[PDB]
Amino acid sequence: APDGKKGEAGRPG
Amino acid sequence: APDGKKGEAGRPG
Amino acid sequence: APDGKKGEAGRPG
Amino acid sequence: APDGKKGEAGRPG
Amino acid sequence: APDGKKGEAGRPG
Amino acid sequence: APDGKKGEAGRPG
Amino acid sequence: PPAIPGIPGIPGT
Amino acid sequence: PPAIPGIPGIPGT
Amino acid sequence: PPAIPGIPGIPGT
Amino acid sequence: PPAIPGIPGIPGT
Amino acid sequence: PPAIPGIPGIPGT
Amino acid sequence: PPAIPGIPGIPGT
Amino acid sequence: GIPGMPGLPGAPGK
Amino acid sequence: GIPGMPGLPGAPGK
Amino acid sequence: GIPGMPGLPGAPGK
Amino acid sequence: GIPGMPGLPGAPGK
Amino acid sequence: GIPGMPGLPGAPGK
Amino acid sequence: GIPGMPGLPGAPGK
């Protein structure tokens, strides 16, 4: 069961 | 037959 | 054969 | 039946 | 074998 | 097994 | 009866 | 019972 | 006759 | 055991 | 012969 | 051997 | 029975 | 019979 | 048993 | 015979 | 055995 | 034999 990658959150500024 | 949702149009400005 | 919708081009400015 | 995640709305400003 | 379309690169400025 | 292409990172500025 | 995907919305005026 | 996809979120006010 | 996906639109001039 | 897709990330503060 | 998806384009210089 | 999708790229520093 | 996908919302003007 | 996907709309200029 | 996709998050205002 | 998907176009510079 | 999709990364703030 | 999808490219900084 090859499962997907989880995305990154954006950065502050 | 579970069918998909239709998207919204953008707003003016 | 239910085929997909083609997208719109962007507008000039 | 593994069902999908619902997206977040954007923030005001 | 109906194969997909390749995307365009962005323009300079 | 035709596998997908990996995306590019963004550039600095 | 397999399902049909939904149409994406347009950018606003 | 095959699975159903999730709804995309809206742009904020 | 299985269906074919649609082409994405271009950015405007 | 068929695979499950990953969750998309959020916009940053 | 099942079909292969297309490659996404790059951001411009 | 069915195929595996590719990883999306990150925003740049 | 396979289910369908949903669409995206457009971008606001300026 | 499997159905197809639709495309996205381009971005406006400047 | 096929699994489903997840949605995208909206864009912030101005 | 299953068909394939198409790609997205890049964003313009500045 | 069908494989899964991956997610997208969020946008930066301002 | 089903084929796979490709990824998206990130956005530039500021």
Numbering used by the authors:
A (entry chain L), B (entry chain J), C (entry chain I), D (entry chain K), E (entry chain B), F (entry chain M): 6 to 18
G (entry chain E), H (entry chain F), I (entry chain D), J (entry chain G), K (entry chain A), L (entry chain H): 7 to 19
M (entry chain O), N (entry chain N), O (entry chain P), P (entry chain C), Q (entry chain Q), R (entry chain R): 6 to 19
Provide passages from the article that reported this PDB entry.
One of the of most well-studied defense collagens is complement component 1q (C1q) found in mammalian serum. A key feature of C1q is its “bouquet” structure, containing six flower-like C-terminal globular domains, an intermediate “branching” collagen-like region, and an N-terminal “stem” where the collagen-like portions bundle together. We have recently recapitulated the unique C1q octadecameric structure in a series of short (∼40 amino acids) synthetic peptides derived from the native sequence of the C1q stem region. Here we use a peptide self-assembly system to design collagenous assemblies based on the C1q collagen-like region.
Then we were able to determine the structure of a small narrow region of the assembly to 3.5 Å resolution from which we were able to build an atomic model. We generated a ∼ 3.5 Å resolution structure of the narrow region of the assembly which resulted in us being able to reliably model the side chains within this region. It should be noted that the molecular weight of the interpretable portion of the narrow region structure was less than 30 kDa. An interesting structural feature we identified in this model is the interweaving of hydroxyproline residues at the interface of peptide B from one PPII trimer and peptide C from another PPII trimer which evokes the “knobs-in-holes” interfaces of α-helical coiled-coils. Such an interaction could not exist in a canonical triple-helical configuration with a right-handed superhelical twist. Further examination of the model revealed that the lumen in the narrow region was dominated by rings of hydrophobic amino acids. Cross sections of the structure revealed that there were three sets of hydrophobic residues, forming rings with identical residues due to the C6 symmetry at isoleucine 7, methionine 10, and leucine 13 of peptide C. The diameter across the cavity formed by the hydrophobic rings was ∼5–6 Å. We are fairly confident in the side chain positioning of Arg16 as that is well-defined in the high-resolution narrow region model.
